């Protein structure tokens, strides 16, 4: 009983514009037809404008069904699916709540591969970025088993002010980066952005009260490159927050494979209650990468938004556990959690880094494997295994309760653990060499012996 998009005129040849047919299918499903189920037979469905998902609709695409992004409009977004209306810039409308939407199967060709000059998207010369989904003010949205290809310096998915969103068993292949782009713009392009709902981060609607995203889970998915464009810059995260935005919360990133990202597998500021668990982060050498960042990378990077005037709600309750890191690039850091500047007024707290396995065989590593900078309270770094590199764990300028218990180190060339504090002008240890533990007793710190050493 699922309605076929062919029932409404979709040709599926990649030449005819099938947008209207697809929209009519969705609209009918939203009314109740076919139980809200829409089906996509094998084929290539070109769309020259945005398709709008509606409440209680469920799209299923054949394995050989491909949605081709043909949205090439000046001063206009090039995102295939949205959960709210959009016409032209300057005519945005408020997006009302939507819910119970599912999308499964097939491929979405965001069509962002570069022209031979590498200055623009070859098939969409007028766009500034391309993506697949713009999910805003939505509830209970499920995206699964979808292959996303060639984003033109954009977000494959944006989840803003949305609750109960699941991205599962999908593949994010390739992100095109043109010659002309600056680093500032580049690192702000996460393939899956999870953010509060503001016009700044979600210019597709008028909603501007900073509604948070909540209960978002990205799991069992693969992130890498395609045969047309290089590795993604940042797989998941966000890069913006203000006193007026509510922090996305209960964000779970589980069992994903981040295959050689250029900057980070996970990077964010302004999240609360995050769980990054059982993921695999691989990083190859510059020579085997299409995209490479000279400035370096940090596979997991929970940082603080640059702001010295406001007391922001910086990252809190972040758990980084049981992840595996295979690093070959000497400029790549495995894990980083920080309040980047002593000038930031907010606080980073309740940080847990446990049972992670770091395999660093890069030559002459240029930085620590695990960096914890200015955590204000409740920091736990325990039972992590680090194979290779220079420094193992660096804890700098952290306050409050700190617990570092039974981590393992093998074949390291530098200090296993560095517990550092600074004064208004310089640096000195809080209290050191080899493997040991740190505990907080009555507000005070103390090194404790543990007999776990490398005998390789
Ligand atoms: Ca969580
Ligand atoms: Cl939970
Ligand atoms: Mn339009
Ligand atoms: Mn956004
Ligand atoms: Mn944005
Ligand atoms: Mn490229």
Curated annotation (Swiss-Prot):
GO CC annotation terms, alphabetical: extracellular region
Keywords: Cell wall, Coiled coil, Peptidoglycan-anchor, Repeat, Secreted, Signal, Virulence
Keyword Lyase (UniProt): no
Disulphides: none
Start and stop residues of the PbH1 repeats: 138-161, 213-235, 248-270, 348-374, 376-397
Lipid bilayer topology: Peptidoglycan-anchor
Biotechnological applications listed in the UniProt record: Has potential use as a vaccine component.
Phenotype upon loss of function: Cells lacking this gene adhere to and invade human cell lines half as well as wild-type bacteria. They grow less well in human blood, perhaps because they are more resistant to phagocytosis.
Location(s) in or outside the cell: Secreted, Cell wall
Function, as annotated: Acts as a fibronectin-dependent adhesin and invasin. Binds host (in this case human) fibronectin, plasmin, plasminogen, and human serum albumin. Where the bacteria adhere to human cells there is major recruitment of microvilli which seem to fuse to cover the streptococcal chains. Antibodies to this protein reduce bacterial growth in human blood.
Name of protein: Plasmin and fibronectin-binding protein A
Species of provenance: Streptococcus pneumoniae (strain ATCC BAA-255 / R6)
């Amino acid at each position: 009983t699922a309605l076929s998009v062919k029932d409404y005129g979709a040709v599926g040849d990649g030449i005819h514009d099938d947008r209207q047919a697809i929209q009519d299918a969705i609209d009918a499903a939203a009314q109740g037809l076919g139980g809200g189920n829409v089906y996509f037979p094998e084929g290539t469905y070109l769309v020259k404008e945005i398709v709008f998902l509606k409440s209680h609709t469920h799209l299923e695409l054949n394995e050989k069904a491909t949605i081709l992004n043909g949205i090439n409009i000046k001063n206009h977004p090039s995102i295939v699916f949205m959960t709210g209306l959009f016409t032209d810039d300057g005519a945005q409308v408020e997006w009302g709540p939507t819910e119970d939407i599912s999308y499964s199967g097939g491929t979405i060709d965001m069509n962002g591969a570069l022209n031979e000059e590498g200055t623009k998207a070859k098939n969409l010369p007028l766009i500034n970025s391309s993506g697949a989904f713009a999910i805003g003010n939505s509830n209970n949205v499920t995206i699964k088993n979808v292959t996303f290809k060639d984003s033109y310096q954009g977000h494959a998915i944006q989840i803003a002010g949305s609750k109960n969103v699941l991205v599962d068993n999908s593949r994010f292949l390739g992100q095109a980066l043109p010659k002309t782009m600056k680093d500032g713009q580049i690192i702000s392009k996460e393939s899956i952005q999870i953010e509060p709902l503001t016009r700044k981060g979600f210019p597709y609607a008028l909603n501007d009260d900073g509604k948070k995203s909540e209960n978002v889970t990205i799991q069992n998915s693969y992130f890498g490159k395609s045969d047309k464009s290089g590795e993604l810059v940042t797989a998941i995260g966000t890069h913006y927050q203000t006193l007026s935005t509510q922090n996305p919360s209960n964000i779970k990133i589980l069992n994903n494979h981040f295959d050689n990202m250029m900057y980070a597998g996970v990077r964010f500021t302004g999240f609360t209650d995050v769980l990054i668990k059982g993921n695999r982060f691989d990083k190859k050498v510059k020579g085997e990468s299409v995209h490479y960042r000279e400035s370096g990378a940090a596979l997991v990077n929970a940082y603080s938004y640059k702001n010295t005037k406001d007391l922001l709600d910086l990252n809190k309750q972040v758990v980084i556990a049981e992840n595996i890191f295979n690093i070959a690039d000497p400029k790549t850091k495995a894990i980083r959690v920080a309040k980047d500047s002593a000038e930031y007024l907010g606080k980073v707290s309740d940080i847990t880094v446990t049972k992670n396995v770091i395999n660093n065989n890069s030559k002459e590593t240029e930085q620590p494997n695990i960096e914890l900078l200015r955590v204000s309270d409740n920091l736990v770094v325990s039972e992590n295994s680090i194979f290779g590199g220079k420094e193992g764990i660096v804890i700098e300028d952290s306050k409050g309760k700190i617990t570092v218990l039974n981590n393992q180190f093998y074949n390291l060339s530098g200090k296993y653990i560095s517990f550092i504090k600074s004064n208004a002008n310089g640096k000195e240890p809080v209290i050191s060499d080899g493997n040991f533990n740190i505990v907080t007793e009555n507000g005070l710190y103390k090194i404790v012996t543990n007999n776990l050493s490398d005998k390789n």
